[PDB]
Design an enzyme around this catalytic site. Structure first.
Site, short mmCIF file in Angstrom:
data_model
loop_
_atom_site.label_atom_id
_atom_site.label_comp_id
_atom_site.label_asym_id
_atom_site.label_seq_id
_atom_site.Cartn_x
_atom_site.Cartn_y
_atom_site.Cartn_z
N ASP A 35 17.94 -27.50 15.61
CA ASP A 35 17.20 -28.74 15.84
C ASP A 35 16.07 -28.48 16.83
OD1 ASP A 35 16.30 -31.27 16.24
OD2 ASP A 35 18.09 -31.97 17.37
N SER A 199 -1.96 -33.00 14.15
CA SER A 199 -2.48 -32.75 12.82
C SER A 199 -3.90 -33.30 12.71
CB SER A 199 -1.58 -33.41 11.77
OG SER A 199 -2.13 -33.34 10.48
#
Length: 330
Positions: A35, A199
């Site tokens: 994770d 992004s």
């Protein structure tokens, strides 16, 4: 040193991925959920409340000659999906894919919430975010990657998750045969303890690319892709009959649909998520309403590049002094 381990979807939907991890002496192998959005290595154990164990493999520290109680240390964690766990702490030897760390904090669960009990395939979590998020008190503990870093050939790990297929976590090296083209690296902020990056935009299907900054985290422990409501609405508007359902808890779409791809920007590069990766199947057995793999982050507080996005790429988690993320097509 290096390590290399195969990671395997827990079910036919890729709801999560499990990687075998050797703990203790002699080794006890548990299948952990790696994770990158949390920083605790915790396991079902001989200390877990018996009614809360349902098929998981347990760590028994009393059977490990290298286990030592970390006296006074406790841990307690709550995840973004509302699940939680808590317990005490041992140090022990932990190996992943041939890479061994001695003295790793292994957090032994005394209590786990129902969602963990109900998932017999996940024996615990191995956190790979920054150690500043580790929940052990009163002495915070380091992640497996942090402990291994100095010994690794290069201070990196990579995630290569499969679509409906096994993939690989590598530590200490970049497998240049595992991706196509070049790896594009992008800046990371560690201020919130995550692999947080920005992004450069998105496209829906064959549509034009929209340049826009989307700050979010690379999170192997989250199944879906969570993005701003504007972006998600633009995606699902391209799917006839798709709608956001308050009763189901997100966007659903007709199972008869063919989904468009979704592209996200990494600098000037582009990662394309095929439409099929966005199908999470019937909302309930036999239903013709299917659950979408792209969902709004509006109720979370952060955008999350979860498995739906990451499995479309070869992803480098670069733990150099100034960390960065790398993405390549594959």
């Amino acid at each position: 040193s290096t390590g290399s381990a195969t990671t395997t979807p827990i079910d036919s939907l890729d709801d999560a991925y499990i990687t075998p991890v050797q703990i203790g002496t002699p080794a006890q192998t548990l299948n952990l959920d790696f994770d990158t959005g949390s920083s605790d290595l915790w396991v079902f154990s001989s200390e877990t409340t018996a009614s809360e164990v349902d098929g998981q493999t347990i760590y028994t520290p009393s059977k490990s000659t290298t286990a030592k109680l970390l006296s006074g240390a406790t841990w307690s964690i709550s995840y973004g999906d509302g699940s939680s766990s808590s317990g005490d702490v041992y140090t022990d030897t932990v190996s992943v894919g041939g890479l061994t760390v001695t003295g790793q904090a292994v957090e032994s669960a005394k209590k786990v919430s129902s969602s963990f009990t109900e998932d017999s395939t996940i024996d615990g979590l191995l956190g790979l975010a920054f150690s500043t998020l580790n929940t052990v008190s009163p002495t915070q503990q380091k992640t497996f990657f942090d402990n291994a870093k100095a010994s690794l050939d290069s201070p990196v790990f990579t995630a290569d998750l499969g679509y409906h297929a096994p993939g690989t976590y590598n530590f200490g090296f970049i497998d240049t045969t595992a991706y196509t083209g070049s790896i594009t690296y992008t800046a990371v902020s560690t201020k919130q303890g995550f692999w947080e990056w920005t992004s450069t935009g998105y496209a829906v299907g064959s549509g034009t690319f929209k340049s826009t900054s989307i700050d979010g985290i690379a999170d192997t422990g989250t199944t879906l892709l969570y993005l701003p409501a504007t972006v998600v609405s633009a995606y699902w508007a391209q799917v006839s009959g798709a709608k956001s359902s308050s009763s189901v808890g997100g966007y659903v779409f007709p199972c008869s649909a063919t989904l468009p791809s979704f592209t996200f920007g990494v600098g000037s590069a582009r990662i394309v998520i095929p439409g099929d990766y966005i199908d999470f199947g019937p909302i309930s057995t036999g239903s013709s309403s299917c659950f979408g793999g792209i969902q709004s982050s509006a109720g979370i507080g952060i955008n999350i590049f979860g498995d739906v996005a990451l499995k479309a790429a070869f992803v480098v988690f670069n733990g150099a002094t100034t960390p960065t993320l790398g993405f390549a097509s594959k």
